[PDB]
Amino acid sequence: QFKDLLLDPLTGDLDFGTPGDRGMRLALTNQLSLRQRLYLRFAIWAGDWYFDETFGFPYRTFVGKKTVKAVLDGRIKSEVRQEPDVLQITDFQSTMDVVSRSYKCFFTVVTAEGEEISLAFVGEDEYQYPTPPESNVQLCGDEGVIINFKNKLYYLINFRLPK
Amino acid sequence: RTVVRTFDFELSGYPDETFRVVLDSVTYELRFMWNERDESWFMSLGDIGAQRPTITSKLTCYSDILAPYRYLDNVPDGNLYLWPLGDIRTRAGRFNIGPLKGIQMTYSSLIE
Amino acid sequence: LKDVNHIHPLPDFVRGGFDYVPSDIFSGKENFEQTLRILLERLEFIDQKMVELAELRTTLNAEDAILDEIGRQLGIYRNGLNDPEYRAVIMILTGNNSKSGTRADIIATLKQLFGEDGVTTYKGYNYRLDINIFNTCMEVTDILPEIIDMLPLVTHLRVVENQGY
Amino acid sequence: ISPAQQAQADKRARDAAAAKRKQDTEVSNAKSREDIQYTMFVSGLRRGRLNEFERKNRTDDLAILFDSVTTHTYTKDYNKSSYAVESKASDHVTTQDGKFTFSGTVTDSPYLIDPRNMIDRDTDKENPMLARRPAKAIEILELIADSHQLVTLVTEDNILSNYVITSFQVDRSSEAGSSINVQVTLEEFRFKRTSDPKKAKNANTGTKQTAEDGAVDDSAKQKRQTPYIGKNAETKERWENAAIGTTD
Amino acid sequence: MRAMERTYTLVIGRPVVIGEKPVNIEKFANTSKGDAYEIKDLHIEFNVKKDNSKEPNKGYVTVYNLSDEVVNYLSVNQRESLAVMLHAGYNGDEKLIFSGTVEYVEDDFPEETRTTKFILGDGTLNLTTATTARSYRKGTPVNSVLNDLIADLKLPKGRVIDFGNQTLQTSMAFTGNASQNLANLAKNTGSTFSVQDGAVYWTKEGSRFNVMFEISEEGGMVGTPTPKQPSSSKKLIKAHDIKEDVGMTVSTLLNGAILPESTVYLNTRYHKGFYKVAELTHRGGYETGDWITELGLVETRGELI
Amino acid sequence: NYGLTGSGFNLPPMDDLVQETKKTFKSAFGEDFNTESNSVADKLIQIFNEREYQLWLLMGSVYYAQTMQGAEGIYLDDLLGKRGIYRLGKTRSTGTVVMTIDSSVPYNMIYSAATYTIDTDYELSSDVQVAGNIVAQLIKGTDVGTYRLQIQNTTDQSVKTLSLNLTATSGQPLITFFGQIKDFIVNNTILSNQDRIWIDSTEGALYIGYDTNKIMIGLSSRVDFRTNPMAGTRSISMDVRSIEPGYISRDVHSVRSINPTPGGFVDIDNLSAFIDGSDVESDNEYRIRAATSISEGKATRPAILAALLNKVEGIEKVRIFNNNTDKTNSLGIPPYRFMVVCYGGGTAEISQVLYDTIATSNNTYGDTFYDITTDQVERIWHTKAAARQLAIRVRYRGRPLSLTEETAIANGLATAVNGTMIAGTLYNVRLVGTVMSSTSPDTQVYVDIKNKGQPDSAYVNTDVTASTTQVLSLELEDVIFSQI
Amino acid sequence: ENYGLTGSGFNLPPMDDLVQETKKTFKSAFGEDFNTESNSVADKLIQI
């Protein structure tokens, strides 16, 4: 439920929205929040962000060196579980090509969805305060009491005659 | 009647919280009970170790809780109010009470 | 999406509690159910009357037998008024406490007694004011004393009542 | 010295500090969620204990199976007054916490790789030794002990619950290469919010002071008051200052 | 699944300065920099005794391997009285357990481990320096004398039981420390006076206040209650009769929401009934040691004030 | 213990009731009766008990329904109904908009109210005519020939005409022509307008109702003005309301479109935030309004004085007079009619404010009127003070004052524009003090005052007093200095 | 340009105006069709 500015999954810029409803949006669904929380966590190289030297991933250890596939997978699979709301990891297809020296892995992560605790900070309210009456209706009655009775009588006259 | 803010409250949401607070150099004990059907907090105020609470009332927003009770030697003379930090239409809830949860329960004391 | 007034009869009160029979152990025995139903259904009546004890005490629906109590607290005694208009006077006098007797204001108070189109007001140069009534639903002579009270200190007033235009 | 070393001492401090943020963070979240329940299967399995082994899923009721368990022992203790009693005064005895210990092994050449075991979450089917199974077990073992989980033991005869790990040992001797010997010790735990109001009981919190960094606590710490976001500044403004005033 | 583990917090604030109004240790927590020096995850050993008597409640504390900056901040202010608060509980909340001034502080750092020491006093400065000079004539209502002397002491009034329409029988004069004079008025009128965690408590001996606390195996009791005499000596008796003279002892897991003048209900299998509280002792060893509280109870025979 | 006590209404938990009723059962059948877990009586009693918890909670809720705190929904109205305050229903947003129009759109053309929508939820408040609603004008570049100028006097109702020839299309002749137009306009309306019109000689363009940064800020009020050769681009002001009642808000520069585009349209935009509409009134703001009713004063002389000064885009000065004794009195007034004098408040906008007058107080006297719909429609009256400009001469003995140093003195005499209607007396001593104040300290000084246009013999020292409907005025260029 | 020391004195901009051109220039980079009304997420950020 971690709120934050929404990042476009397709381009990487802020998700200002479609041309018909351009604006700014907050990440509300846990899925969207977790997506960008993993994306930033993996995209920032370790130590390259000032104000926090411990954040990021240490790509320099592996890239450019002769490395064992098994060791890399452990670190990749470990960084994911640093988020407190990750249920499990389903599958992991780690493959390496020696000709091009490229490495490419696949996997998915499962996360549940929570409640909103309070709507005070977001948009709307859930209550239905009453509407003041109109004109002399309060002190003298209402005509609808006649209309509903007339309709009931008419529908009952309709019911008895077979159709 | 000049008044200055001097204390703020927070609630953990437990339905039968009870704790002691100090206001205007005097000490009091407070009890908060959650009502299911009426979804509202019931507050009881009394002296430390008192047999029965001195005041019991229902909490609501923008209502002076102590207004009709500033004539007793054991009741604070300040002002106790609940007002929201977010949208003005939000009413007091269970978990939304606190300095940043949405509702600011506050006590303020007159200047003497 | 939800009503703010939580004072309502509990929906489906009876079937609740029966839901607390552990594992249908007694259900379908027709001997324990009747004993439990007979006791629970008594609370139904009490639960229902808890509302009227609060609903009926409001000034809108208060009956004359207790409406007098509401009026007594405000100093508005029954005198010779009857129930339908005794309610009106209570509203009129109470509403007077936040008024200034302006032309727009006067129309608003008369609005609650004669519907939307039942009243009109002419104005005159030398303090003259006129009130017209088209759809009165109550006898006006007994209401008249209040109709004077919410007017400026120096008003000159005429009152004419008729049915329709 | 030279600036070249200052750019080197920082690296020594930065990388070393990053280690705590990894290990120290994992235990924090592992304690922040009580839903997960760990279990261990020491022997027992094939004598009908499979009835409850199949209940374990891969998300909440995690299960651990060792490649082999050599011995496990269970023991309880009691004590009594060493002085003659006055006479029946049978209350002169106390019960201690029962202890449980066992020895096991994890090998690079497993014979059974049932995926239900949490050790084999993502182990390769055809190359068990590249999966580095012994390293997988240790990573799991430290996290369970560090977070102080109440483990449940399923044994040959009985079932034990509310047991915490107090010590374990790992070694790689010259003999039995490509495997690790593991020892564990556990003891009983005599353990004794969002809650139903019907179950609530009167509680206490003692004396309390100004709560959290509020509009008043900020003044105490000399912090500047938080500006108000102007969603609406027409209604509250006339009333807020007149009735609540300002901290000053 | 977790275990049930201990937690605590210790805070150090600005020097305490007495003025012309009641002293509240709460407002001195913040340091000139703002946030105070908080110490959470360091092995700590403390002992805090409380009572209902003239003397203030004092507590001892020890901390191992403190950072040099914090020790430096205490090397300074050695002429001054820093305000300190202590909290304890179980991993979900921490109740105030002591608040006062640092009377003493010393550091010994032999080889491997430094060990800081503290001695804290609950209102020691006020109780030992508040002078008074008052007098009254025959006929003065005693209820007026009591209020006059307490206001001099400059402390918040936790709870007081006025005397009613009592009047002085002889002229009276009071000087010296206000606390000493009040403690003398206690003897001749059957009233108990004692300051605690900054609150002034004036009650009447023999009588007691509801069941504010219940003790049972569910309430984390530790062992069965045992009868222990409330004083180390016996007085001659005619055999005011209303006075104390009996008591019991109980132990429980640490719980700071208890005070000497409170009332407790004892729900055990042998002993059952209501008792006053007379003494408290809080002990604690974070990494190793007990985390319990000991209560000395006293039987009551007066009216239910 | 938990029912009605001396300190309000309390609430019991479930367990206390359970224990009490179990004790009752124990007493019923001795200490041997079983009541825990396995007893059928236990299953009946526990199930029975939980329901009365609901009854107790509802009863507790009922009690607070008749107290200053705890009232909600319908019950809240009754409590505050005793004090004559009622909730507000659905409301419609209201506001004003302006749009620029092409040079070719004729003056007399009138926009149909029911054939346009500003945006998805806004429509014209009522019918609008181009003439008489010009708020700002821009003239630039392309405009030789003969030109006619028309303007309706803002104090009288006599149309004024001016005749000029544009012999040249640029240069000093064009500058002089623009200056003549400026002098023509400023002599009517209000002097505050001249501060908002100037000529940019570098570009040879004339700006009406703009600021130095070329932002349309508008004149002091809607007016009528025409040129027989319709040059430049004109701007008008419209009144807009929302289609359906509800909640909606718009900012200072939000409105940007019109669905059916009228011919000659140029642009459209806001000038100030709209009075946003609201949904059904909620409890919190209901209590807030109930709390702040103290300042709500009306139908009194101080109240009417305060209201005018805080409800008009102008109204620099205001004063009232009374005549209520059987006769017209010295000042020409009907026997029982009030008199209100204002300055720079417009006609329609100020007229609406006058609905705070005491009912049955005739008022309705003056030289200008307007009609307002209540339903019935009624007419109100008032007047606008006629400004009178003064000419001031300053003589002194001392060092000669340098150019650009007299600016402080000239602006210092701005106090002369602060005189009140009728009761305005210069107190030349005050002027002497001011002229000696807005300068560095330091021999002799005198002040002479006369009406504009009079010969130099009219200079005097005695103080001047405003007429019944006149108010003092002064221009910066009408100050002179002499050394002695 | 009309802000700060100016020889004739010192000029201070009020709270409201600074928002106005900030939104205006901010709007210029994304066109008119860009929500910036009250309580909108973008507006909330600008105010801070």
Side-chain angles (χ1 to χ4, degrees), chain C residues 4-5 13 16-17 26 32 47 50 54 57-58 74 95 98 101-102 106 120 123-127 152 155, chain F residues 40 44 47 51-52 55 59 62 66 72-75 78 82-84 86 299 337 357-362 376:
Chain C
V4 70
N5 188 358
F13 187 109
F26 284 0
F32 166 86
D47 186 74
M50 271 275 198
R57 282 219 317 276
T58 193
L74 303 165
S98 66
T102 62
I106 290 160
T120 54
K123 179 178 180 180
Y125 290 81
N126 62 307
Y127 294 150
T155 183
Chain F
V40 188
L44 289 181
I47 285 180
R51 285 301 184 225
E52 312 68 350
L55 274 296
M59 184 64 31
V62 167
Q66 308 190 28
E72 181 256 0
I74 182 58
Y75 298 98
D78 320 60
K82 308 299 305 311
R83 198 154 39 209
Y86 326 120
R337 304 204 187 241
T357 301
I358 297 164
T360 76
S361 283
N362 286 335
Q376 290 78 15

Side-chain angles (χ1 to χ4, degrees), chain F residues 55-90:
Chain F
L55 274 296
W56 278 94
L57 287 164
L58 260 64
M59 184 64 31
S61 186
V62 167
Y63 170 74
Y64 284 166
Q66 308 190 28
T67 303
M68 304 338 170
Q69 65 280 18
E72 181 256 0
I74 182 58
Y75 298 98
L76 182 68
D77 321 67
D78 320 60
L79 181 79
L80 291 180
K82 308 299 305 311
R83 198 154 39 209
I85 311 181
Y86 326 120
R87 295 146 85 99
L88 306 189
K90 320 297 294 282

Side-chain angles (χ1 to χ4, degrees), chain D residues 41-87 89-229:
Chain D
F41 281 79
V42 286
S43 82
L45 179 44
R46 296 179 180 177
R47 294 181 184 274
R49 291 301 198 205
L50 191 43
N51 64 7
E52 70 172 325
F53 178 62
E54 295 180 353
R55 293 214 298 280
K56 305 323 209 322
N57 57 65
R58 272 191 157 208
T59 52
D60 293 18
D61 295 331
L62 310 162
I64 300 90
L65 281 154
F66 302 86
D67 295 307
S68 173
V69 164
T70 310
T71 68
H72 67 79
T73 185
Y74 172 52
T75 179
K76 303 180 50 49
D77 189 358
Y78 311 79
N79 40 48
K80 58 174 282 292
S81 174
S82 299
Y83 309 100
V85 299
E86 184 65 20
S87 84
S90 192
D91 191 38
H92 294 95
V93 295
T94 82
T95 64
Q96 300 296 306
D97 291 332
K99 296 183 289 294
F100 192 90
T101 64
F102 66 91
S103 294
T105 297
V106 179
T107 185
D108 295 352
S109 171
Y111 167 55
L112 179 62
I113 319 182
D114 183 338
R116 285 176 285 191
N117 184 357
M118 182 194 47
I119 300 179
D120 305 290
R121 274 181 307 223
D122 65 329
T123 187
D124 179 43
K125 180 58 52 177
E126 69 275 16
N127 200 323
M129 295 177 71
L130 268 290
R132 301 184 66 190
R133 295 176 73 258
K136 298 293 148 61
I138 291 165
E139 181 285 348
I140 294 164
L141 190 64
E142 293 179 353
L143 178 137
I144 288 167
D146 287 9
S147 60
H148 305 156
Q149 300 296 334
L150 298 185
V151 187
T152 299
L153 304 186
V154 174
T155 62
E156 175 64 26
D157 291 331
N158 52 16
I159 300 176
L160 311 175
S161 48
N162 311 321
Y163 274 59
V164 296
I165 299 178
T166 51
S167 60
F168 70 94
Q169 194 167 15
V170 172
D171 66 8
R172 216 183 292 260
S173 304
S174 185
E175 294 181 354
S178 74
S179 79
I180 57 176
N181 311 313
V182 182
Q183 287 186 60
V184 189
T185 297
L186 301 99
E187 293 82 3
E188 183 178 1
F189 210 70
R190 298 294 299 275
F191 175 109
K192 288 170 98 64
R193 274 141 271 171
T194 56
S195 300
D196 179 7
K198 295 179 176 66
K199 297 181 180 178
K201 294 182 180 180
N202 291 332
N204 262 296
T205 61
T207 306
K208 300 291 183 183
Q209 294 81 42
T210 304
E212 295 180 354
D213 60 350
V216 65
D217 195 30
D218 265 9
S219 76
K221 297 181 180 179
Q222 294 178 356
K223 314 322 301 303
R224 66 183 292 172
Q225 303 334 320
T226 293
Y228 167 61
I229 300 306

Side-chain angles (χ1 to χ4, degrees), chain E residues 14 61 73 93 106 118 125 129 161 180 183 199 261 305:
Chain E
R14 271 176 295 110
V61 175
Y73 183 70
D93 63 338
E106 181 169 57
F118 303 83
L125 183 62
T129 65
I161 307 296
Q180 179 52 91
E261 292 297 72
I305 61 174

Side-chain angles (χ1 to χ4, degrees), chain A residues 7-84:
Chain A
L7 272 168
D8 187 358
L10 277 296
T11 67
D13 193 1
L14 312 191
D15 191 355
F16 290 129
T18 62
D21 65 333
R22 289 198 66 75
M24 293 182 286
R25 289 165 184 70
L26 294 178
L28 297 178
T29 45
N30 192 358
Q31 178 170 121
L32 293 171
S33 174
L34 181 45
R35 184 184 64 81
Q36 58 188 64
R37 284 153 57 205
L38 289 171
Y39 172 70
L40 295 190
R41 182 176 281 274
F42 270 102
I44 290 162
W45 295 36
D48 274 303
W49 189 56
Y50 194 90
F51 311 106
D52 210 352
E53 311 325 330
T54 71
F55 193 78
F57 193 101
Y59 293 112
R60 292 289 183 88
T61 306
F62 309 107
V63 169
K65 334 292 281 183
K66 299 208 84 178
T67 189
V68 185
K69 196 181 83 71
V71 180
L72 184 52
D73 302 339
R75 180 100 192 97
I76 301 299
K77 186 180 289 293
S78 189
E79 211 76 0
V80 170
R81 323 152 170 281
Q82 290 222 307
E83 299 308 340

